[PDB]
Design a protein around this motif. Structure first.
Motif, mmCIF file in Angstrom:
data_model
loop_
_atom_site.group_PDB
_atom_site.id
_atom_site.type_symbol
_atom_site.label_atom_id
_atom_site.label_comp_id
_atom_site.label_asym_id
_atom_site.label_seq_id
_atom_site.Cartn_x
_atom_site.Cartn_y
_atom_site.Cartn_z
ATOM 1 N N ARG A 172 58.546 -9.792 79.521
ATOM 2 C CA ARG A 172 59.584 -10.163 80.471
ATOM 3 C C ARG A 172 59.080 -11.176 81.484
ATOM 4 N NH1 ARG A 172 63.987 -8.930 84.044
ATOM 5 N NH2 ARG A 172 63.787 -6.683 84.377
ATOM 6 N N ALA A 173 57.929 -10.904 82.097
ATOM 7 C CA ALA A 173 57.363 -11.802 83.085
ATOM 8 C C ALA A 173 57.123 -13.184 82.490
ATOM 9 C CB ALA A 173 56.048 -11.270 83.639
ATOM 10 N N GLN A 174 56.422 -13.260 81.354
ATOM 11 C CA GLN A 174 56.004 -14.512 80.730
ATOM 12 C C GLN A 174 57.224 -15.380 80.412
ATOM 13 O OE1 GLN A 174 52.286 -14.148 81.082
ATOM 14 N NE2 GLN A 174 52.009 -14.544 78.923
ATOM 15 N N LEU A 175 58.267 -14.759 79.864
ATOM 16 C CA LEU A 175 59.495 -15.438 79.494
ATOM 17 C C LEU A 175 60.213 -15.891 80.745
ATOM 18 C CD1 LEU A 175 60.412 -13.097 76.542
ATOM 19 C CD2 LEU A 175 59.577 -15.458 76.426
ATOM 20 N N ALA A 176 60.504 -14.953 81.645
ATOM 21 C CA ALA A 176 61.204 -15.256 82.875
ATOM 22 C C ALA A 176 60.442 -16.276 83.726
ATOM 23 C CB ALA A 176 61.451 -13.961 83.644
ATOM 24 N N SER A 177 59.137 -16.453 83.486
ATOM 25 C CA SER A 177 58.332 -17.432 84.204
ATOM 26 C C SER A 177 58.809 -18.844 83.832
ATOM 27 C CB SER A 177 56.843 -17.193 83.917
ATOM 28 O OG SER A 177 56.045 -18.124 84.629
ATOM 29 N N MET A 178 59.061 -19.109 82.548
ATOM 30 C CA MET A 178 59.613 -20.391 82.091
ATOM 31 C C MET A 178 61.074 -20.560 82.531
ATOM 32 S SD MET A 178 58.143 -20.137 78.196
ATOM 33 C CE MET A 178 58.573 -18.565 77.450
ATOM 34 N N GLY A 179 61.665 -19.585 83.227
ATOM 35 C CA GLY A 179 63.079 -19.593 83.556
ATOM 36 C C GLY A 179 63.933 -18.990 82.442
ATOM 37 N N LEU A 180 63.361 -18.266 81.465
ATOM 38 C CA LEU A 180 64.180 -17.554 80.478
ATOM 39 C C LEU A 180 65.093 -16.587 81.226
ATOM 40 C CD1 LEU A 180 63.977 -14.351 79.215
ATOM 41 C CD2 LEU A 180 65.429 -16.015 77.974
ATOM 42 N N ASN A 181 66.391 -16.660 80.956
ATOM 43 C CA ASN A 181 67.404 -15.856 81.623
ATOM 44 C C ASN A 181 67.564 -14.519 80.913
ATOM 45 O OD1 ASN A 181 69.344 -14.772 83.192
ATOM 46 N ND2 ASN A 181 70.930 -16.264 82.777
ATOM 47 N N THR A 182 66.837 -13.503 81.342
ATOM 48 C CA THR A 182 66.935 -12.171 80.762
ATOM 49 C C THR A 182 68.333 -11.577 80.954
ATOM 50 O OG1 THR A 182 65.989 -11.285 82.838
ATOM 51 C CG2 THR A 182 64.460 -11.780 81.202
ATOM 52 N N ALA A 183 69.060 -11.961 82.013
ATOM 53 C CA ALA A 183 70.410 -11.463 82.239
ATOM 54 C C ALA A 183 71.416 -12.071 81.261
ATOM 55 C CB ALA A 183 70.847 -11.736 83.681
ATOM 56 N N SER A 184 71.089 -13.156 80.550
ATOM 57 C CA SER A 184 71.980 -13.682 79.516
ATOM 58 C C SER A 184 71.984 -12.813 78.249
ATOM 59 C CB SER A 184 71.619 -15.133 79.165
ATOM 60 O OG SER A 184 70.363 -15.231 78.524
ATOM 61 N N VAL A 185 71.103 -11.808 78.143
ATOM 62 C CA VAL A 185 70.866 -11.090 76.916
ATOM 63 C C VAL A 185 70.772 -9.613 77.289
ATOM 64 C CG1 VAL A 185 68.595 -12.462 77.058
ATOM 65 C CG2 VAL A 185 69.114 -11.002 75.019
ATOM 66 N N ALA A 186 71.930 -8.939 77.261
ATOM 67 C CA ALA A 186 72.116 -7.550 77.667
ATOM 68 C C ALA A 186 71.306 -6.635 76.750
ATOM 69 C CB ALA A 186 73.607 -7.186 77.659
ATOM 70 N N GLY A 187 70.105 -6.272 77.194
ATOM 71 C CA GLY A 187 69.090 -5.632 76.370
ATOM 72 C C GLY A 187 67.705 -6.245 76.567
ATOM 73 N N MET A 188 67.576 -7.346 77.307
ATOM 74 C CA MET A 188 66.291 -7.929 77.672
ATOM 75 C C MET A 188 65.896 -7.530 79.083
ATOM 76 S SD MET A 188 64.958 -11.803 77.178
ATOM 77 C CE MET A 188 65.199 -11.477 75.424
ATOM 78 N N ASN A 189 66.876 -7.430 79.965
ATOM 79 C CA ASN A 189 66.681 -7.288 81.396
ATOM 80 C C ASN A 189 66.308 -5.866 81.853
ATOM 81 O OD1 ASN A 189 69.637 -6.935 80.570
ATOM 82 N ND2 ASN A 189 69.574 -5.987 82.567
ATOM 83 N N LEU A 190 65.893 -5.008 80.921
ATOM 84 C CA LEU A 190 65.570 -3.597 81.113
ATOM 85 C C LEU A 190 64.208 -3.208 80.521
ATOM 86 C CD1 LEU A 190 68.396 -4.166 79.540
ATOM 87 C CD2 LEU A 190 66.408 -3.481 78.154
ATOM 88 N N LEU A 191 63.518 -4.105 79.807
ATOM 89 C CA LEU A 191 62.268 -3.797 79.094
ATOM 90 C C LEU A 191 61.026 -4.221 79.864
ATOM 91 C CD1 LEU A 191 61.848 -6.626 78.062
ATOM 92 C CD2 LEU A 191 63.063 -6.066 75.968
ATOM 93 N N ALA A 192 59.860 -3.858 79.325
ATOM 94 C CA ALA A 192 58.645 -3.914 80.100
ATOM 95 C C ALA A 192 58.209 -5.356 80.388
ATOM 96 C CB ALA A 192 57.513 -3.136 79.417
ATOM 97 N N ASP A 193 57.534 -5.547 81.519
ATOM 98 C CA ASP A 193 56.938 -6.827 81.911
ATOM 99 C C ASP A 193 55.683 -7.151 81.113
ATOM 100 O OD1 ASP A 193 58.476 -5.921 84.627
ATOM 101 O OD2 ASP A 193 58.351 -8.110 84.519
ATOM 102 N N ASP A 194 55.243 -6.262 80.221
ATOM 103 C CA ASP A 194 54.262 -6.530 79.189
ATOM 104 C C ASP A 194 54.773 -5.948 77.859
ATOM 105 O OD1 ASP A 194 52.073 -8.013 80.566
ATOM 106 O OD2 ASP A 194 51.364 -6.110 81.388
ATOM 107 N N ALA A 195 56.081 -6.033 77.579
ATOM 108 C CA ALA A 195 56.634 -5.720 76.257
ATOM 109 C C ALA A 195 56.309 -6.860 75.294
ATOM 110 C CB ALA A 195 58.157 -5.551 76.341
#
Length: 101
Positions: free
Chosen positions: A42-65
């Motif tokens: 989650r952290a690594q992706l969201a660092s590039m600006g990946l929008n975890t809230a665009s994908v209902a099922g990403m915004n709830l998983l681990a910051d080292d998933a």
């Protein structure tokens, strides 16, 4: 098919042809070009600006998933160029926050 067995590789993440970070990136076996994909979190992706809230099922998983970036998101990819050590990456603008810096 499978043309690279699993591990970790020291490379440069290049999202949308833009260098993001330099590190080792563990991969797990998968379906795409090489037959493996990176363990992007989650952290690594969201660092590039990946929008975890665009994908209902990403915004709830681990910051080292080992996030299924390219199986929960479409059109994105994570091509490890070993030859150039350039982890060629894409994300569709839909799954971007507003800035990929």
């Amino acid at each position: 098919g499978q043309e690279l067995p699993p591990g970790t590789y020291r490379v440069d993440i290049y999202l949308n042809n833009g260098y993001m970070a330099t590190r080792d990136v563990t991969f797990n076996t998968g379906d795409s070009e090489q037959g493996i994909v990176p363990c992007l979190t989650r952290a690594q992706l969201a660092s590039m600006g990946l929008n975890t809230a665009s994908v209902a099922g990403m915004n709830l998983l681990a910051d080292d998933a080992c996030v299924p970036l390219t199986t929960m998101v479409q059109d994105a990819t994570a091509h490890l160029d070993v030859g150039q050590q350039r982890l060629n990456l894409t994300i569709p603008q839909a799954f971007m926050s507003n800035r990929a810096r």
